């Protein structure tokens, strides 16, 4: 059984380059007793790569999720045919022993694409939906700042927000993802690359200040937001895609006279925190959330696993509309 | 009647100089009904106040808390004598209504000194108080890492957490404070100023991380620190006294990535925010602690008001052992 994998060929410098990866065809041994192999449909593309990637040798595996279907089975429970989440890596095929699969919910409809599981209803929902949920704590009736808006994450986190009763100021970096997010509902949606002032546009777009941040993007963004939170407001510390292809040092943290002044609470996350009951719950409701319309959802759908390299150097550069999503 | 008051006389610019300060005599009016006359007997000078001044105008009065006897009185609630919490800033006298005035705890022993009501048993104690057992919400047996260790706030940190059952860690910017902390009990405490290597203290301080930050100090100490937090390390910010006399840009935040992995729960805080019955109880905490031996207090009482800026300096340049005071 033959299959191909993109490696890290050298660490990144700033963003990605095509010579940074190197694609290998390589032999899969015979499946031993209780494995199955997978044969990759979609994968993902994520901007936690570019970080993880760091922690790489030369030679290894880039990380990643994929929806796959079991082609060969030695596992009962697992026959051939059945649809699951893994995560092997940027490879067509490789072999599980089970442990570390997740079957699609139960009542996945035909009318919603597997590949969803990868985005709205999967980790990037689920970072949304207990990130602005838990560690924003919204009741409803808040104002929220969430950037990188359009991406898988921040696109939920504003569309769970309004049907919580909340305002929605969302960043982008484009024209074409602010006219997206103001169709689904986002009360305030700007680019921040062309805006005059940043700091300006944060005012006009909320005069009260902000009681929650859902933060994607760190740096200097952040530290602008920080300025206009309101007494007590709470800022959920999701991402900082803006350090990730850093080049020199990072950017002046947050003025401290203003995080104290206004007593901010800052908390850090990651969607593998919760689990079980929590995390069954909370994709239950994404696809609930999706059927009923209150949450819509945008691919993007690259043909061809030789076109991963691409598809994440795209993802990571903003140019794409949509969850970027490998289609094998 | 007569007073003498310390004013603004220019805006700070790094750290305060003499000539930004300027002395006045002015003329107190005669008391009207329901009103107080108050003579300073200790005042206090505190790292706030080179923040909040910058709000101040040109000519105004420097802001501060005062132990203040009533002299002449019109309010039957406060007879000649009484001794009160007030904070009419710099200056040895002042009129008072009664309703922005504190008495002291009606079991005010006569073995403590009245000053301590600006400090161990005032609000830099309630700060640690608060701080520690609420916003770092330590239970016992945790290890704690607090900076300024020797301040007013931070030797109250490090008591209470010793008495909690915690590991104390504490770092200070002079031998004499080393060596006073270690006396007291803490388990670890270190010059910051001298050491080799401050990631390499800090490891060795404790090789499995820390699970609470009590910072008072901010700047890049703190991001040596956060980066040896436990997962799901609570950090408390109280101050970041490292940077109120900056000029230039703030120092880089911490690595997001390791914020973010590391999970990390920050919250920022002011003593006002708890009232009432809250306030009332850890007062008579922290008056019964120091009364058993549990906490040591230290004070650097310097005599004449005259000499309040100079303590003012000399308190943020770290050169006095003991929360500083002026004896009116
Ligand atoms: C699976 N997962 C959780 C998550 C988070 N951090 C990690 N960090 C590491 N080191 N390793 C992991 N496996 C990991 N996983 C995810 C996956 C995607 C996104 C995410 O932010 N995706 C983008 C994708 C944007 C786009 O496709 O354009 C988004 O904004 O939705 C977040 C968490
Ligand atoms: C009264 N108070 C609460 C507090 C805190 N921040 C404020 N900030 C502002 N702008 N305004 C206030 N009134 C204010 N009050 C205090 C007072 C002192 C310390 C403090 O940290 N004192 C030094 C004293 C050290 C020394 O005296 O040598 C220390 O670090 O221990 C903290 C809070
Ligand atoms: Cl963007
Ligand atoms: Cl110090």
Known sequence: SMTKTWTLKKHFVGYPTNSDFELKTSELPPLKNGEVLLEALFLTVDPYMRVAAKRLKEGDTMMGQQVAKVVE?????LPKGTIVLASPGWTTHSISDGKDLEKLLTEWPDTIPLSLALGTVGMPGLTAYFGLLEI?????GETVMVNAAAGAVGSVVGQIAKLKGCKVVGAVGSDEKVAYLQKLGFD???NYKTVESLEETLKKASPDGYDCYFDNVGGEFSNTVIGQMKKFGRIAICGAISTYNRTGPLPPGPPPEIVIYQELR????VVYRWQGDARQKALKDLLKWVLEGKIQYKEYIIEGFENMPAAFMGMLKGDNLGKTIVKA
Chains 1, 2 share one sequence.
């Open 266 to 269: 800052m908390e850090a996350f």
């Open 188 to 190: 305030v949606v700007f």
């Open 73 to 77: 089975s030695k596992n009962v429970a």
């Open 136 to 140: 924003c704590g919204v009741k409803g």
